[PDB]
């Protein structure tokens, strides 16, 4: 039955981190009295922890923004290839944003080129699509939410080669259509482009804020 | 105002993991942008990252078990110093309401 106790606290650790917050410590032992033949167990903790503050901001790596708008599907130093069997190219750009304090630069290609046809302002024959899937009830949480589905005059895309094989290094290109065409179709309900319909959503639940719900 | 400083933001559940401790400002805790902060144990853990919308939650159960109803899901802007997409302060939410059908008749 010997009552043990704490010894001297050791040297404090330096602040580990060079930015932000960190945690330091001191170590003590139960070595001077020592519980012998039973007793207690020194009463407490053999370790204290403390927050150290360097007051200097930390690196943040840059992230990619969303891709820009596609360039026009024309040829450099020529004219245009609209309404024609001519595969062209177009480019797109990204922007690295948010890089501060010697952070890592954005990884990847900042440009994107893909091959294309041009149906910009091209008169194309059309056919009405079927009814689209019912949209979201808008406005959510507002007075009287309503859905919306629609039929639109879908253009008949011309039967062009979707795969064009160039030479040089024998590179074959997945070619996709670009542009806003002018779809021609017969009127449905007094409208030429898009005819929609709305229906109210039934048994609308009230919106309760999750921070207001937990409390 | 001082705040509790946590070392990790879970993001899958929005909880504050790994308590570095308290008695420290929000500016000094959010120098490391991988950290997170909350006031006491009440909740709302905000990461020290630049503000960005979280993941859309799972769809709520449909308001009726019969015919056409309506269901909600939320998304909370989490972050510090800045705004989310749409002039949204950190803490505000956005909802999507969809028509559901547990049983069609």
């Amino acid at each position: 039955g010997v009552a043990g106790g704490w010894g001297p606290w050791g040297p404090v650790s330096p602040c580990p981190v060079t930015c932000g917050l960190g945690q330091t410590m001191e170590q003590r032992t139960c070595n001077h009295p020592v519980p012998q033949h039973g007793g207690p167990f020194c009463a407490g903790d053999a370790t204290r922890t403390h927050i150290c503050n360097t007051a200097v901001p930390c690196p943040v790596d840059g992230e990619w923004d969303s891709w820009g708008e596609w360039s026009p599907c024309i040829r450099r130093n020529m004219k245009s290839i609209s309404c024609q069997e001519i595969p062209g190219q177009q480019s797109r750009g990204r922007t690295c944003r948010g890089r501060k304090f010697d952070g890592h630069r954005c990884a990847g290609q900042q440009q994107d080129i893909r091959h294309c046809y041009s149906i910009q302002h091209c008169p194309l024959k059309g056919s009405w699509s079927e009814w689209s899937t019912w949209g979201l009830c808008m406005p959510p949480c507002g007075p009287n939410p309503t859905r919306a589905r629609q039929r639109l005059c879908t253009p008949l895309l011309p039967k062009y080669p979707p795969t064009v094989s160039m030479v040089e290094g024998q590179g074959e290109k997945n070619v996709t259509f670009w542009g806003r065409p002018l779809p021609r179709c017969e009127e449905l309900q007094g409208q030429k482009l898009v005819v929609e319909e709305k229906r109210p959503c039934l048994h609308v639940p009230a919106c309760k804020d999750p921070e207001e719900e937990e409390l | 105002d001082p705040v509790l400083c946590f070392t990790q933001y879970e993001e899958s559940s929005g909880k504050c993991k790994g308590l570095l401790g308290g008695g420290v400002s929000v500016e000094d805790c959010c120098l490391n942008t991988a950290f997170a902060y909350q006031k006491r144990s009440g909740g709302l853990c905000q990461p020290c990252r630049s503000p960005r919308w979280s993941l859309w939650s799972t769809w709520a159960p449909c308001s009726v078990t019969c015919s056409e109803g309506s269901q909600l899901r939320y998304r909370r802007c989490v972050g510090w110093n800045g705004q989310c997409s749409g002039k949204v302060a950190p803490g505000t939410l956005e909802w999507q309401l969809q028509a559901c059908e547990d049983q069609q008749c």
Epitope: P11, S13, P14, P16, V17, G22, Q23, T24, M25, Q27, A46, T47, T49 | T7, G18, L20
Partner: nanobody, 124 residues
Framework: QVQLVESGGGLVQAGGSLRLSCAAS????????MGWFRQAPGKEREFVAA????????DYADSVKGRFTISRDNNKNTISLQMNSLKPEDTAVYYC?????????????????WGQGTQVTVSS
């Protein structure tokens, strides 16, 4: 930055005991969380045991739990691995590892400083 020197390996009979020790750099000792790894013949390096900067928090692999014990002496800049009930599958080069830890009770499994190793061979 920090240098690590292992000692205590050798040839042990099966069922016997061996105590390894790892000496680290003196001025930066309490900054790094530390641990033990091993690499058997023909196998990848595997985690054995970890200890925090405190010496109060420990973590062990399932293959060595109950047989091995990791300890830390913050007076003498050493850690130790007391290996009991040794089996021929414990034959490996045992490595001491050091890693920067923000919290003093955190045990790590990822480490960026490694010693040269000590050879432990267990004969049946």
């Amino acid at each position: 930055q920090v240098q690590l020197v292992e000692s205590g390996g050798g040839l042990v009979q099966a069922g016997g005991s061996l105590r390894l020790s790892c000496a680290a750099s003196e001025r930066t000792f309490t900054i790094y969380a530390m641990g033990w790894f091993r690499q058997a013949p023909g196998k990848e390096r595997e985690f054995v045991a970890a200890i925090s900067r405190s010496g109060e928090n420990t973590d062990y692999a399932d293959s060595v739990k109950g047989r091995f014990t990791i300890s830390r002496d913050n007076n003498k800049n050493t850690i130790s691995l007391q290996m009991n009930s040794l089996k021929p599958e414990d034959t490996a080069v045992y490595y001491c590892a050091a890693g920067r830890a923000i919290l003093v009770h955190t045990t790590k499994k990822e480490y960026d400083h490694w010693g040269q190793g000590t050879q432990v061979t267990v004969s049946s």
